[PDB]
């Protein structure tokens, strides 16, 4: 009893190692990297930009304002 209806041991098996390597790389790589990067960036990125309107404007303007700036060029003199 040895090879006949037995085998026993992993015997390295390149096919098994290859699948394990690719599986881990794809899972951890695509999942973690792609998941967190693409997932978070897209979620928080798009939501934060559209929601908060970060890109320009924001809400107001640190400028004194007072009452706008110029409705259509005026002159009080």
From Swiss-Prot:
Per the record, the major location class is membrane
Family matches, as InterPro entries: Intrinsic_membrane_PufX
One BP annotation, GO: photosynthesis
Where in the cell? Cell membrane
A single GO cellular-component term on record: plasma membrane
Matching Pfam families, A to Z? RhodobacterPufX
Give the UniProt keywords, A-Z: Cell membrane, Membrane, Photosynthesis
Entry keyword Cell membrane: yes
Q: Does the keyword Membrane apply?
A: yes
Protein family (similarity comment)? Belongs to the PufX family.
Name the job this protein performs. Associated with the reaction center - light-harvesting complex I. May play a critical role in facilitating the interaction between this complex and other components required for light-driven cyclic electron transfer.
Provide the protein name.
Intrinsic membrane protein PufX
Question: From which source organism is this entry?
Answer: Cereibacter sphaeroides (strain ATCC 17023 / DSM 158 / JCM 6121 / CCUG 31486 / LMG 2827 / NBRC 12203 / NCIMB 8253 / ATH 2.4.1.)
């Amino acid at each position: 009893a040895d090879k006949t209806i037995f085998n026993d041991h992993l015997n390295t098996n390149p096919k098994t190692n290859l699948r394990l390597w690719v599986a881990f790389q794809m899972m951890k790589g695509a999942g973690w990297a792609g998941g967190v990067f693409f997932g978070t960036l897209l979620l928080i990125g798009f939501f934060r930009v559209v929601g908060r309107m970060l890109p320009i404007q924001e809400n107001q303007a640190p400028a004194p304002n007072i009452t706008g700036a110029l409705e259509h060029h005026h002159h009080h003199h």
